Amino acid sequence: GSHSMRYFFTSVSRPGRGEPRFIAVGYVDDTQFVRFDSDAASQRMEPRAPWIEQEGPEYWDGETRKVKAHSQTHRVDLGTLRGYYNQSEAGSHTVQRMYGCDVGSDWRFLRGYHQYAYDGKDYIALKEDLRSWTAADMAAQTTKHKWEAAHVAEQLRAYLEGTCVEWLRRYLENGKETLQRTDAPKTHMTHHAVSDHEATLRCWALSFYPAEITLTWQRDGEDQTQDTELVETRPAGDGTFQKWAAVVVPSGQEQRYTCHVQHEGLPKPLTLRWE
Amino acid sequence: DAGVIQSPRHEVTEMGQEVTLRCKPISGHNSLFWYRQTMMRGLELLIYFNNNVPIDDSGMPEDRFSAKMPNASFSTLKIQPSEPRDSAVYFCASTWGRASTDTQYFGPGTRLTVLEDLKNVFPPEVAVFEPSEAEISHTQKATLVCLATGFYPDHVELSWWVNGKEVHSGVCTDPQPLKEQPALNDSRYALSSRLRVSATFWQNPRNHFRCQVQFYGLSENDEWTQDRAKPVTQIVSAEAWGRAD
Amino acid sequence: AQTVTQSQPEMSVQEAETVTLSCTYDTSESDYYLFWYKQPPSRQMILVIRQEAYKQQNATENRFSVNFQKAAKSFSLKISDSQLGDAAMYFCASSGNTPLVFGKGTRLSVIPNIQNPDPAVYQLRDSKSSDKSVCLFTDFDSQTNVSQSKDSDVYITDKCVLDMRSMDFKSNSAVAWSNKFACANAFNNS
């Protein structure tokens, strides 16, 4: 199928409580595989998947050097951004960065991205064409000009189209069992009486992968969102996902409602009814 | 100058002493790098800053070396205590600080020699030798020679000065000194330089030729208890005038 | 994970002829820059030429060009119409995990083309006292080897090329002196 490799960085200043906390996480699709936490003791880029453990020691030295330097540029960015917005040195602020590349089913480069957030809001981002920038405010315009002068877009492009996809393909092969699987959802329906007349029909999807799923309810085979509850897809803790949809129903009428389950691991969409 | 400034060009200290090298970046540059050059190890990165934040200090010696960048205008790299192994040329470079791929602009360096003791330090004697009149008649050119002799360590900067302007055209200075007593490890050094001018220029009695050797030696905070003048940082000069005949 | 290799530490070129300085490198990624730096005896580092690894065209700066072969991880430097001023240490370099990493460097020497050999030895007297004297051996061509002193109290320097640019004239010379010693058989072993 199509796949992606993504890195997420979060840097939080704590004025007068230590150097800023810095957390980096690496993902292939929905599966985490590396980790760095500046408050952890190891001070290393640690593995978080089994298939990444078969990298050599020189890989872990190199990722650790690159991630420790990431942390320091973010420590600097925090200072710069405080300046840019005329903020005090008492407030705790947040720098977020996300970058990655997507490959299609032939595993060839398809799309690249590099975005920054400051304080929960968009700051600057590479445009889909990987040649321009989208600066959010006036402050971000300053960074746009710094990076256009240094040709930063061009340089990111050579990582996104180069090392990024080429290492995404190596990870996809090393982890073929984990990463190329589709786990079809294990579905079932439950019935919980609320009153002596009203009932809850809950439609469950469990142990699936990837996380992309659709749950919808129908009444007499007609789409119904009224009186329904959807919870956000949640991680099971073992690398699969869960989700449920629920509809409150007048008792006696349960048999009119059908839950429908779409997931790419299913040859055909499931239909579930109360029985 | 609007380049990277490095104080001072040379420095001789005795081991055990303290050593503080200073660097000023190109104005507007927000990132500063320290390197050291040796004949054994080549160019080695020591530490660098961006916005005065220490970004990487991998290559710092684990115990005696320290660096600060107190504000955007200067950085110190400090050695305590100095040891002979610390002798190298210490380069400072700056960049705009937008990216690690930014072009680095290098300073002239500070070459530091850490001697086991200062008992062997000697200033240079300087003499200028007027052109041979046979050369003038055979070639219509005139070669002056300057000899800088008896100095130690190898911390000299020989320049030629004609009518008060430093001269580069027509100069050649020995790229390596030689040992006056080559059998000895602490032998003093000698250096020679030539300045070639046309005969008619040397033949004008109003032309002034000065050979200046800047020597980098002791401070007057260094102690001295030897039976000869303290070998302090100094300029030694010899001169000559044009002669019609 | 980031190395630069300069295999030949010493290279020679004849004045006005061209010379290629070799460089190979190992890099772990695809976002890198490559550089050539020059260091004259003055020790000042000057940027000769810059190659961005994402750019495909070879970088050229006047008489300086590089043969950037990405797949071979080779980045040689071509100096055409070489000049006495090109004599220096050249350093191959790269930006990766570390912002600058230098190779071990190649010392290029430029043998000056002595248009009109005119070997001579002259004697020069001191300007203050005139008991002291040096011997000057100049204007020989660049194939000449200068013998080191075998008296143990006579000093003979190596050869040294100077450029009288305002006359488009270049010459070699070596200097000798002692405490005695005459100049006519001072450079006899050279």
């Binding site: 890195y7 980096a24 690496g26 880029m45 990722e63 690159k66 991630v67 330097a69 990431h70 540029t73 600097v76 960015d77 710069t80 951004l81 840019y84 720098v95 970058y99 920054y116 700051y123 600057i124 960074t143 710094k146 990076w147 240094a150 930063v152 340089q155 990111l156 990582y159 090392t163 990024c164 290492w167 | 927000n30 961006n50 916005n51 970004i55 600080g97 937008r98 990216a99 690690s100 791929t101 | 772990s28 990624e29 976002d31 890198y32 990766g96 995990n97 912002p99």
Partner: peptide, 9 residues
């Protein structure tokens, strides 16, 4: 593999 290039806001 993380990108080597470091940029500054």
């Amino acid at each position: 593999r993380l990108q080597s290039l470091q940029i500054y806001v």
